[PDB]
Structure 1
Amino acid sequence: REKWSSKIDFVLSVAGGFVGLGNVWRFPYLCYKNGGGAFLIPYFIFLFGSGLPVFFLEIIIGQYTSEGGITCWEKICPLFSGIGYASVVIVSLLNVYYIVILAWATYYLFQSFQKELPWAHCNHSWNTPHCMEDTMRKNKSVWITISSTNFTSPVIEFWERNVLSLSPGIDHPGSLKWDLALCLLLVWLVCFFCIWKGVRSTGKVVYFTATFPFAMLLVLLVRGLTLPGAGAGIKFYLYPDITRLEDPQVWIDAGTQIFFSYAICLGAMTSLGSYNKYKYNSYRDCMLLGCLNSGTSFVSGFAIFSILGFMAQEQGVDIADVAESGPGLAFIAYPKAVTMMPLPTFWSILFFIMLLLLGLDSQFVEVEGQITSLVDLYPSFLRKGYRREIFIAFVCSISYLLGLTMVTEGGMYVFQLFDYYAASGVCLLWVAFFECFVIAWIYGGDNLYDGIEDMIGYRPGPWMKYSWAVITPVLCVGCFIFSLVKYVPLTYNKTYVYPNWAIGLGWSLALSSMLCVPLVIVIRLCQ
């Protein structure tokens, strides 16, 4: 019922909504898991094919219908309202597992206040006799003679035991960790208190909050590019291997990284664009913001892969045999980088503060989008007041209780299963394909273009029309069929095999989001 007070608020909110952990943490290890470069080819293809057109489509639908995640599809096609519900389920699961990264970040922040960084060396109560210094790991006298593969690094050991304490498998949950639960509770309390008061933006602090992360990223890039072995990392990151293009995995994990980074199919963008003025030019902004996001991801990829190549040269092993083919890549690369900056504790605190800022503002945007998408369903009941406040309290408490399962001794396997099935992969393809299909073949590209021209002042080019019509559905169907034809089970890191019931649980997680689309159709057609 309210609009933006000024047009800078919309730009700042959208800039803080889709820039964060998906550009600095998830993109690097997805690039690292595959060859690199062979991941970039489908990335840019998917970018210019679907990433920008669907984002602009969501913004235009929000601006043209003046509604949220679910109700927007009611003014387009009532039969396909299940896309909103699927988006809400996806964003709920994402909210559940996405704050554990912030919990690890605040655990590192609290551990950073010591005079000496704990992960710099290994002289501790949780170190194997196999540990050796990263500087001393590559030595022709003591390491290359024997036990080359048995050795491990202090950073990896810290991440595996002190923070994670890995159990032998998912079948052995172990005991609960109380400090991580406390950190999770603290982050959830901060998130709840920032919505109690409805604090949004500032007067003379936004130009600090939105510019400090970029300055920190610039310092990180300058540090990384000046380290030995950065050229090998850049070559690994850029030059593609044509053989890997025949594996469905790279094609399916390159087209979903973009859908994750641009916050597509979550219901957040169709609500962010709702408060805009009717006669406002959003094309230029959608283009500039997409350019900013993709450039940030590409530059951060340079920054992380430089130090990755440096570490691989330092340990004297293969590029693919360092760090982790999983969610722990950032928490191994970045701390190793800040270990060598002057005054390491200060830069460590600054880096974890900016990481928390990037994660939190996104968390705020996604929680706000979920709450809006919910309250447009029931305005009278979820009227502003105490009811809406206890609603947020209940949602936060339930999400904390569910996320407790990832802080046990076997929570890492649950976390990897969630990352791979919950709010990524095939469900994103499902919802994106249905969105593009319903908007291009049921509603009409020309019919939309008339609305844009009425709202923007001129007729746009036919690029997005032909994108929505053919380019995105073809890719979405091809990737899905190609993955089904050649099936490969998920493996955590590289040497681990999941039990069959765990894979069944993951497929149930994905199908919980998928089946919203056909069940709503059969329910509506029943009566």
Structure 2
Amino acid sequence: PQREKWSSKIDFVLSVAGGFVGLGNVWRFPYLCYKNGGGAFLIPYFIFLFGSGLPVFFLEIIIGQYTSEGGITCWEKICPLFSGIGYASVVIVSLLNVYYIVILAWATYYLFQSFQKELPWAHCNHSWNTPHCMEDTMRKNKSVSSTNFTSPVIEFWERNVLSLSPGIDHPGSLKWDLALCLLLVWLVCFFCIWKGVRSTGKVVYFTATFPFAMLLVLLVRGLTLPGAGAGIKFYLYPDITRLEDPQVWIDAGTQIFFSYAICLGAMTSLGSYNKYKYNSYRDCMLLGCLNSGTSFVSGFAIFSILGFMAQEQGVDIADVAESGPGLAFIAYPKAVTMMPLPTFWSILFFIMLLLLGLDSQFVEVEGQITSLVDLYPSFLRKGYRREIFIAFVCSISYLLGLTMVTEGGMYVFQLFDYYAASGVCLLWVAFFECFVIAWIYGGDNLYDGIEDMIGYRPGPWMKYSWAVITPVLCVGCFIFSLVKYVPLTYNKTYVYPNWAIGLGWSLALSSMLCVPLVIVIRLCQ
């Protein structure tokens, strides 16, 4: 009928391979682990992984396969009254795309700036450089006032790319080059969606192999760098005392729900095209193992780079980097300078970032569009109308993202990254999914359908995880965060005014309130 299906299982595998693999495995994980002490981030990370990450991902895949519907419509046949989880997921992904494409815009700016003989961030002698700047090579000299010194890479990222304002209360003026880069990326996405240009043919081999080969050579270079042992020890060995703060637990619980693309309506859409009699269990387990291994292995390379930088700069590891949403843009551009012929490797690395980010970008944008289409199949899922819908959505998203390319858009970006598609809202959605599935629908009723589909009956390692481990963890993290409140501080120094915190809380509540509002609306009818 109108609903189409995958031509072969290889399409599903290659779709998921780019959909939850991208910037969240090599960009968000490093500074999230770096800010929260280091090794202490891993214990709650693995606990949340084996407690809810694979279980909820597999549950979403099974609901998609068993319902043959999108993010919003599956809950209509699962539990009509507890609908609104799909609406919250759509809100989360809509707010996520806006600031997710800004990273791609920064990558495009870096790639365009890479097209000359000398990389601009290698040295600091330009107009934007402070008199405080000097090269990292000579920073450790006893002659060279050891607190006000700064590295060329940090100054470049702070002024040339960002032009950081004193605070969110001074937006400044708009930057036109960043707006052009954002428009270019949005045009590329629109052309890749409108004409259906995708990874179909022999190009999939390159599209899948090249990022992993680049990651492997990056890891080899990082592990070869001196001072990597200190970075590895910082990354692995935990601190027991830091475990008493809710921030580490809530960051670890959010990396599992973010990198795996959970609670945003993409996995159910991807599983909606699968075959009824298809063994999704083994494929889902293998893909989850691949994703977790990707995050874990990229952590080794990036923390070895951080350890080398801390060793060369003469300072400690915890105060050698930006420790915010832009740690990768200091860590990796510093790494590509050591490799022979730096320009070629820089171009390759930025193309690799663009590829990993874009395939996911397309995945979640298409998931959002399909979820919206499933609500109105008559007025959408059409020709020119479906074109103008995507065009209007892209234009609105570009206009909204224009607010983060000004001189004071870094604070807005950090606020979005903390309150938009992560934190309390993700725990809210995951709890309300696992609770309903385990208690109202029934965990034993789903095993019968699973046996009908995959052929055999799985074990109880997941029926208990959907019913006990996940709700307890979600409620505990929520209560612990509420009891001990610590305000957000960008780069440990900036103090956000009360109105900014209220704006962030309103951003989070816009997604959180969907469930109670839908419940009361349905009960009123």
Identify the TM-score tier after normalising by the shorter chain.
over 0.9
Displacement of 1:134 in angstroms is 0.4
1:79 is aligned to 81
**CA displacement, residues 470-503 of structure 1 (integer Å, 9 cap, x when unaligned):** 0000000000000000001101011110000000
Number of residues of Structure 1 aligned to a counterpart in Structure 2: 523
Displacement of 1:71 in angstroms is 0.2
Displacement of 1:198 in angstroms is 1.4
**CA displacement, residues 349-388 of structure 1 (integer Å, 9 cap, x when unaligned):** 0000000000100000000000000000000000320000
**CA displacement, residues 148-179 of structure 1 (integer Å, 9 cap, x when unaligned):** 01000000000000000000000000000000
**CA displacement, residues 159-216 of structure 1 (integer Å, 9 cap, x when unaligned):** 0000000000000000000000000000000000001111232211100001100000
Q: CA RMSD in A?
A: 0.5
SS at match of 2:196: coil
Contact 2:191–2:197 (8 Å) recurs in 1: no
Displacement of 1:140 in angstroms is 1.5
Displacement of 1:37 in angstroms is 1.3
How far, CA to CA, are the matches of 1:96 and 1:81 in structure 2?
25
How far, CA to CA, are the matches of 2:338 and 2:511 in structure 1?
44
Which has the higher mean CA deviation after the structures are superposed, 376-385 or 502-511? 376-385
Once the two structures are superposed, the pairs formed by residues 66-465 of structure 1 within 5 Å of their partners are 66-142=68-144, 147-465=145-463
2:516 is aligned to 518
SS at match of 1:80: coil
How far, CA to CA, are the matches of 2:81 and 2:415 in structure 1?
32
How far, CA to CA, are the matches of 1:315 and 1:455 in structure 2?
58
- Unaligned 5+ segments in structure 1 are none
How far, CA to CA, are the matches of 2:114 and 2:200 in structure 1?
29
How far, CA to CA, are the matches of 1:265 and 1:491 in structure 2?
27
How far, CA to CA, are the matches of 2:381 and 2:92 in structure 1?
25
SS at match of 2:492: coil
**CA displacement, residues 223-247 of structure 1 (integer Å, 9 cap, x when unaligned):** 0000010000000000000000000
How far, CA to CA, are the matches of 2:201 and 2:381 in structure 1?
28
SS at match of 2:146: coil
How far, CA to CA, are the matches of 2:464 and 2:358 in structure 1?
37
How far, CA to CA, are the matches of 1:141 and 1:277 in structure 2?
69
Displacement of 1:324 in angstroms is 1.0
How far, CA to CA, are the matches of 1:236 and 1:7 in structure 2?
41
How far, CA to CA, are the matches of 2:445 and 2:87 in structure 1?
26
SS at match of 1:339: helix
2:28 is aligned to 26
SS at match of 2:491: coil
Contact 2:488–2:496 (8 Å) recurs in 1: yes
How far, CA to CA, are the matches of 1:324 and 1:412 in structure 2?
12
Displacement of 1:82 in angstroms is 0.4
SS at match of 2:429: helix
SS at match of 1:459: coil
SS at match of 2:5: coil
SS at match of 2:177: helix
Displacement of 1:104 in angstroms is 0.3
Once the two structures are superposed, the pairs formed by residues 60-71 of structure 1 within 5 Å of their partners are 60-71=62-73
How far, CA to CA, are the matches of 2:320 and 2:440 in structure 1?
49
SS at match of 1:211: helix
Displacement of 1:403 in angstroms is 0.1
How far, CA to CA, are the matches of 1:322 and 1:449 in structure 2?
51
**CA displacement, residues 395-415 of structure 1 (integer Å, 9 cap, x when unaligned):** 000000000000000000000
TM, length-normalised to structure 2 = 0.99
Contact 2:269–2:367 (8 Å) recurs in 1: yes
How far, CA to CA, are the matches of 1:381 and 1:341 in structure 2?
54
Contact 2:199–2:207 (8 Å) recurs in 1: no
SS at match of 1:391: helix
Displacement of 1:389 in angstroms is 0.4
**CA displacement, residues 116-175 of structure 1 (integer Å, 9 cap, x when unaligned):** 000000010001110011001111223xxxx10100000000000000000000000000
2:474 is aligned to 476
Contact 2:73–2:374 (8 Å) recurs in 1: yes
SS at match of 1:427: helix
How far, CA to CA, are the matches of 1:139 and 1:82 in structure 2?
60
How far, CA to CA, are the matches of 2:236 and 2:40 in structure 1?
8
Displacement of 1:323 in angstroms is 1.1
**CA displacement, residues 13-70 of structure 1 (integer Å, 9 cap, x when unaligned):** 0111000000000000000001111100000000000000000000000000000010
How far, CA to CA, are the matches of 1:30 and 1:450 in structure 2?
40
How far, CA to CA, are the matches of 1:494 and 1:521 in structure 2?
39
How far, CA to CA, are the matches of 2:418 and 2:112 in structure 1?
29
Which has the higher mean CA deviation after the structures are superposed, 197-206 or 313-322? 197-206
SS at match of 2:290: helix
**CA displacement, residues 60-109 of structure 1 (integer Å, 9 cap, x when unaligned):** 00000000010010110001110000000000000111000000000000
How far, CA to CA, are the matches of 1:384 and 1:201 in structure 2?
23
How far, CA to CA, are the matches of 2:200 and 2:439 in structure 1?
43
Which has the higher mean CA deviation after the structures are superposed, 319-328 or 22-31? 319-328
How far, CA to CA, are the matches of 2:386 and 2:143 in structure 1?
66
SS at match of 2:78: coil
How far, CA to CA, are the matches of 1:276 and 1:499 in structure 2?
49
How far, CA to CA, are the matches of 2:252 and 2:293 in structure 1?
16
Contact 2:55–2:462 (8 Å) recurs in 1: yes
Q: Which runs of 4+ in 1 moved over 3 A?
A: none
Displacement of 1:328 in angstroms is 1.1
